[PDB]
Amino acid sequence: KYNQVYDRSAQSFEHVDHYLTAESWYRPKYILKDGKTWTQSTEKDFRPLLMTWWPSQETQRQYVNYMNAQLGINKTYDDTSNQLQLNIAAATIQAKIEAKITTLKNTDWLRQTISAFVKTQSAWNSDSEKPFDDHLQNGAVLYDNEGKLTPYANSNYRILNRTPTNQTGKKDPRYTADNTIGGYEFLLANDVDNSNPVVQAEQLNWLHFLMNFGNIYANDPDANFDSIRVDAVDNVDADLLQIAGDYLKAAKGIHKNDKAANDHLSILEAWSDNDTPYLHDDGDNMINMDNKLRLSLLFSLAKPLNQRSGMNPLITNSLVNRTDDNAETAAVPSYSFIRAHDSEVQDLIRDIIKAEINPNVVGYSFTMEEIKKAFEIYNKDLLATEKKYTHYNTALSYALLLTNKSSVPRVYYGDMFTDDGQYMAHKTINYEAIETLLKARIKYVSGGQAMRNQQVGNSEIITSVRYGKGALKATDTGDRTTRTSGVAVIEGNNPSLRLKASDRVVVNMGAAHKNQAYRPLLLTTDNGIKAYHSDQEAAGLVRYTNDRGELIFTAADIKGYANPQVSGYLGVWVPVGAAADQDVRVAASTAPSTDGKSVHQNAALDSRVMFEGFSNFQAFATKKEEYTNVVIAKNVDKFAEWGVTDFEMAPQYVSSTDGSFLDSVIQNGYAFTDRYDLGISKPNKYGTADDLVKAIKALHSKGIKVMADWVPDQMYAFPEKEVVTATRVDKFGKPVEGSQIKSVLYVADSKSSGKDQQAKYGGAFLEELQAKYPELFARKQISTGVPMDPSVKIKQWSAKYFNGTNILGRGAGYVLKDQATNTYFNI
Ligand SMILES: C[C@H]1O[C@H](O[C@H]2[C@H](O)[C@@H](O)[C@@H](O[C@H]3[C@H](O)[C@@H](O)[C@@H](O)O[C@@H]3CO)O[C@@H]2CO)[C@H](O)[C@@H](O)[C@@H]1N[C@H]1C=C(CO)[C@@H](O)[C@H](O)[C@H]1O
Ligand SMILES: [Ca+2]
């Protein structure tokens, strides 16, 4: 009777949405002070609810056993423990607890011990959330749409799995490269409901903010983000692809001509093979990766010698059949790459961890210790010829990427610099070859392409040829600038490649290059790869074409090698006698686009070079001059020298520290809490907001456009709690068969600060946008059938704007329940 509630007022409990949890404390009518006198209880005398209440006899017995063992009491009560025997034991436990409280006059040990005991109960930990599925964080929980117990978080939407393939709910029949629905809605952390028109409008607001970051933050139009990279296209409602499209038109006029489109060249991270034709049918407002060419490169050059495939795919298995690409404008624009901050980097780290560290590693949720231990092996393997974990023939992949036509190459930072360590600190063994190839791409690479696969000796070789500036076909003759341009690349993927004397590899170079002298650019040696940085530096190894413009090679030149850079043969030749400042690139015409497509893969777009300027595993910064953006501002001249046109920067948002995923362990910037906190409140991994502005300004100085990561899928770890009606679900959002979480209350962390940059800039510019661009809000979106709803600005992120959250390890009955009436405790 003494241990009841002081007053049934909300201030007497530790509530969440006026509900009670297992770890909740309360203020009783009387405190058993020191365990002797029943004293009236002040406001600072909160006590754990579990000290005097239990949601079943079993849990009470477990409480008795655990606290007896923890406090020093001998006797523990077994299976058949009578009802009242447990009550008297709990009274003894309370007496001992208050006695030990007065002996220390704090209540920290009690908090810790109660938390531990709660975490030892079945329905208060992961056990009630199991079975785990293929979610990157073990499981998912979908917030119910009509939660009677919590209208706090309802929604008329939460439309799931609306990928570009599955935008309308049924799989699109127009695209059949992918059997599946082309993605899944639940990827990581708290999943943003991008099917809510309010959230769509807020995403448009965030996009406008990012595109005008300079003006909005430092009153400087020189420091605006030029382009965007839409992250996790396959995990969000694809209506955003229209919204981001529309805007890029209405706000920047990319549809009008080609110069605007190229000045705001936006890309997608869409993995499903259906996404590139879906985007081409959308109107080519953005460009998608060439996944086919990526896989061809990976499986023909990078894989170990056992698992390496033939070389023919490198020609045919792509978006452009580069057998004879004699076209002024390619059918579909694309950007190609071999590695990225995630693709074929964190995968290799996972492989190493699962092999020689922690075989039980779950998804990509690494620990920093595991990361460093694995990186030791990674850095050693990168330097060996016999590679167990890392890529072979990286230089060959980049030699093909930077000479290919009809695609925009994206050079990854971690292929020129160490994936770990400080930014642009230590170079890789391939740095020289890649830099030489970029400079030679500026100087020589232009015109039509021709690729040939020749079976010679015991193996095969491939020859990629660029005819030169102006020469679109082999028959075209061009002019003097044409003759000093063009390039030949000869690659083999077998170290055992040995030709006989009777074997000759013929390489047609184009009608422009008849009887011309050619000098080696890159050459494979036993050392590694010799780069020739000028005609002089290689004048000892000149060779000539015949009267039909054919380079001819034999066993003297082509043989199999096996060194830490080449598992095969690499030979790149350029014509002799080009000006040291010769440039074969083109700028985009101002002529009005006519075909209804915004971005065109013309000769001007082929001249662009994307650069992914960050690694996931960048070492943290000690001093100012080690910040990433500072070093970028310092070394902008290097990027200008390399021919970089679009610099894809890391996501500059400030990182959370929960550690539930790799993104929040190395703090790349994809795990964030405030979407507008671009290094404002705190510095990000790469520098303060002012450092970012300086970097953007320095990049714009040399004419380089800047690309910002647009990440509308998920947000990590909000500070405020919230109780929601929810159901256990897989990554596809299907309810788990007979889980204990079925329309059940759950304590998610889905309430934003409310005094962050999200409160400041949230929906600020909406009023402006429908002023200047009304048609953006006229469009009836595809998945929803209704236009964006900018009426309400999103100042505080609530669970109503979210599809759900990864399982949190809190339990299915973590929200307390009166076992008599079988309803949750309310207030
Ligand atoms: C997490 C990261 O990748 C996610 O997508 C993965 C897919 O689930 C995989 O299936 C894989 O697709 C391959 C399949 O064979 C098939 O889909 C094919 O068509 O394409 C692939 C061929 O090899 O692709 C991914 C491999 O991990 C997710 O969809 C993607 O958006 C994610 N990328 C970034 C996202 C976030 C969000 O926080 C950031 O952490 C990083 O920027 C990246 O991780
Ligand atoms: Ca999603």
Author numbering: 221 to 1047
Excerpt from the publication:
Streptococcus mutans, a known etiological agent in the pathogenesis of dental caries, expresses three genetically distinct types of glucosyltransferases (Gtfs; also known as glucansucrases): GtfB (GTF-I), GtfC (GTF-SI) and GtfD (GTF-S). GtfC synthesizes both soluble and insoluble glucans (α-1,3 and α-1,6 glycosidic linkages), while GtfB and GtfD only synthesize insoluble glucans (mostly α-1,3 linkages) and soluble glucans (mostly α-1,6 linkages), respectively. All three enzymes belong to glycoside hydrolase family 70 (GH70), which cleaves the glycosidic bond between the glucose and fructose moieties in sucrose during catalysis. While fructose is released, the enzymatically produced glucose molecules are sequentially fused into a growing glucan chain and, depending on whether a 1,3- or 1,6-linkage is formed, the resultant product is either an insoluble or a soluble glucan, respectively.
More importantly, we have now co-crystallized the GtfB with acarbose, which highlights differences in the interactions with ligands in these distinct Gtfs. With this work, apo structures and inhibitor-complex structures with acarbose are now available for the catalytic domains of GtfC and GtfB. The four rings of acarbose occupy subsites −1, +1, +2 and +3. However, using a hydrogen-bond distance cutoff of 3.2 Å, 12 hydrogen bonds were observed in GtfB-CD, while eight hydrogen bonds were observed in GtfC-CD. A surface diagram colored by electrostatic potential shows that the active-site pocket is small and negatively charged. An acceptor molecule or part of a growing glucan chain has to bind farther out in subsites +2 and +3, as indicated by acarbose binding, or beyond. In conclusion, our work demonstrates that GtfB-CD is quite similar to GtfC-CD, although their adherence to acarbose differs significantly.
